[PDB]
Amino acid sequence: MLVFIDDGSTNIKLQWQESDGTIKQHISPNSFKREWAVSFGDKKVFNYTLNGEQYSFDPISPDAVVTTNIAWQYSDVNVVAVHHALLTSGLPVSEVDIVCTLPLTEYYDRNNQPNTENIERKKANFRKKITLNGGDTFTIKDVKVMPESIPAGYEVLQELDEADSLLIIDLGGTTLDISQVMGKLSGISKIYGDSSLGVSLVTSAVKDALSLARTKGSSYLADDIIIHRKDNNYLKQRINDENKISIVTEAMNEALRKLEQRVLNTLNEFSGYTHVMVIGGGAELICDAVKKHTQIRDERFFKTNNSQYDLVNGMYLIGN
Amino acid sequence: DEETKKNAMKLIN
Numbered sequence: 040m041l042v043f044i045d046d047g048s049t050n051i052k053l054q055w056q057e058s059d060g061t062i063k064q065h066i067s068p069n070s071f072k073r074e075w076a077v078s079f080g081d082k083k084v085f086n087y088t089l090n091g092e093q094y095s096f097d098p099i100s101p102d103a104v105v106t107t108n109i110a111w112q113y114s115d116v117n118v119v120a121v122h123h124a125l126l127t128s129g130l131p132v133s134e135v136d137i138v139c140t141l142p143l144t145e146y147y148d149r150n151n152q153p154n155t156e157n158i159e160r161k162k163a164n165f166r167k168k169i170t171l172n173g174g175d176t177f178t179i180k181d182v183k184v185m186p187e188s189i190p191a192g193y194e195v196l197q198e199l200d201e202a203d204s205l206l207i208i209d210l211g212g213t214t215l216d217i218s219q220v221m222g223k224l225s226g227i228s229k230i231y232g233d234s235s236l237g238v239s240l241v242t243s244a245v246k247d248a249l250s251l252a253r254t255k256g257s258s259y260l261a262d263d264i265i266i267h268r269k270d271n272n273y274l275k276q277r278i279n280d281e282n283k284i285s286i287v288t289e290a291m292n293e294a295l296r297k298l299e300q301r302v303l304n305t306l307n308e309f310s311g312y313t314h315v316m317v318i319g320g321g322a323e324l325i326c327d328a329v330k331k332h333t334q335i336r337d338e339r340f341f342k343t344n345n346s347q348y349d350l351v352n353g354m355y356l357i358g359n
Numbered sequence: 360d361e362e363t364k365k366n367a368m369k370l371i372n
């Protein structure tokens with residue numbers, strides 16, 4: 040079994056092919072607290088131990104570990120998150136080989152050549168031993184690494200002359216990863232990583248607002264509100280203090296404007312790209328402003344209906 | 360296809 044694991048700070052995305060050749064996808068939010076959870080009734084809890092420390096998957100706890108940083112790539116929580124994603128995917132527990140991911144600036148030196156040091160640090164992290172309480176964990180056999188952003192442009196780069204270049208803008212929870220890549224993947228003009236520019240800018244602001252509105256929860260719940268920002272009834276069902284909905288929506292709106300302006304300023308630093316692609320969960324939030332800011336003709340702008348999965352799908356199309 | 364997929368393999372390390 041070979042499983043493609045785009046292991047992002049916010050969500051693990053999995054893609055893999057079944058025995059009968061059908062392709063499956065699974066997403067798994069990285070919300071874990073440093074304590075075992077308690078099972079009541081029909082609730083199956085996932086309690087893990089790694090290096091003498093206990094964790095549980097907990098989607099609602101305000102004490103869920105905040106994972107919005109570079110260190111997380113090689114962290115213990117990462118290993119828990121990836122095992123948990125495997126254990127909730129529907130695949131039978133087993134040995135597996137995996138292809139995981141690194142941020143551009145971790146995967147590449149300033150010359151756009153692999154940073155074998157960091158690439159190996161990544162592979163070694165998945166050697167850490169982990170226990171699931173009252174159950175068996177998958178065993179992680181062979182580990183290979185790919186860069187983030189770039190693999191998502193695979194299909195599009197195929198029908199692109201080697202003179203055209205595609206700007207792939209990957210906005211995740213922690214990091215803005217930008218790459219400019221020549222047609223047929225014949226070259227890489229430029230990479231760029233900003234690990235202080237993520238949707239967490241918004242997540243963090245929404246989380247604080249929710250707490251003020253007496254809806255104290257995890258980063259995940261805050262993202263859940265960002266995802267449903269356009270649904271006033273959803274907002275009204277989730278947010279406890281009915282009198283403070285505008286505090287959440289406006290806090291969200293201001294951080295979104297900040298997100299936008301910061302992202303657009305970053306684009307000003309690229310030039311000569313003929314095509315523009317926007318991928319990641321953040322794509323939904325910035326795609327209009329990007330298309331507009333780049334004056335790229337409609338046909339040269341690329342945005343899928345499942346932006347969060349663009350990367351892991353590309354990893355699959357390439358490496359499976 | 361073949362040229363792109365070829366180059367794609369440098370993305371796997």
Ligand SMILES: Nc1ncnc2c1ncn2[C@@H]1O[C@H](COP(=O)(O)OP(=O)(O)NP(=O)(O)O)[C@@H](O)[C@H]1O
Nearest residue numbers: 047048049050211212213214238262319320321323
């Ligand atoms: N449909 C949606 N609409 C708006 N925002 C979304 C949507 N889906 C996901 N998001 C946001 O996008 C973020 C998750 O993006 P994702 O691309 O999965 O990050 P990641 O890859 O896990 N983190 P990173 O390590 O920075 O690449 C969350 O913070 C969500 O708030």
Ligand SMILES: [Mg+2]
Nearest residue numbers: 047187211319
């Ligand atoms: Mg990502």
